[PDB]
Every structure is written in C-alpha cells, then in structure tokens.
Design a protein around this nucleic acid. Structure first.
Ligand code: NA
Length: 91
DNA sequence: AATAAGCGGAATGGGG
DNA sequence: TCCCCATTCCGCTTA
C-alpha cells in the first residue's frame, strides 16, 4: 500500500487537487495545504487506504508528524506548510 | 468566546 | 513475536 508521503508527492506531481495542495518552493520541497480545501484531500487519502472511518486533516497531520524523526516530511513554521526530504524528492 | 492549527501520548489496527 | 506504517481517540497548547 502507498505511503502517505508518496500519496502527497504524487498529487503534487499530477496536479489532480491543485486547490487543496501546492508547492511553495518546489526546489526546496516545501508544500502547503489549503485551509478551506484540505479536508477533501484528507477524505481522498482515507478512501484510497480503505480505512474504516472517514479521514480528516487532523488525523492525516497526526501521521505526518510521525515522519519528523525519520525525516521524510518535516513541519515548516508557516501555516499548513511542510517539507519533503531531499531523499524523498530524488526518488 | 469562536475558530483553527498544532501537538503527542496512548490505544488500536495492518500487514507482514 | 514483534516491527511496519499508520489510524483513532483524547486532552492540551497556541494563535
Ligand atoms: Na497541519
């Protein structure tokens, strides 16, 4: 099954949900969610995963925080903004 | 207050 | 057994 960080990277590459997520500085790998349209993206993640409950941005961001220590995604000190690692971007 | 983002400990669930 | 990779729940903090 696809990992959350890969799902997000794939969306940014395809542009399928441009009103929910976008690059801020693509060369640096920083990206940001839409305040008003992030829940539709979270819903999509849960449906793709086949999860029992409806996915919310809160639960998706809880999973995102677990990447902080391994490094695939880190929180940036800007509203709704995160950053992929060089390793993730290179693959 | 209302609204919202951000946090993580802990319990629980996936699929090896 | 016991790690993988989350998901779900809850209470708290910060803006
Ligand atoms: Na967030």
């Amino acid at each position: 099954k696809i990992r959350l960080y890969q799902f997000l990277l794939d969306l940014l590459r395809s542009g399928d949900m441009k009103d929910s997520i976008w690059w801020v500085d693509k060369d640096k790998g920083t990206f940001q969610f839409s305040s008003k349209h992030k829940e539709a993206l979270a819903h999509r993640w849960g449906i793709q995963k086949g999860n029992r409950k409806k996915m919310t941005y809160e639960k998706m961001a809880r999973a995102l925080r677990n990447y902080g220590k391994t490094g695939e995604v880190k929180k940036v000190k800007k509203k709704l903004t995160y950053q992929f690692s060089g390793e993730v971007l290179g693959r």
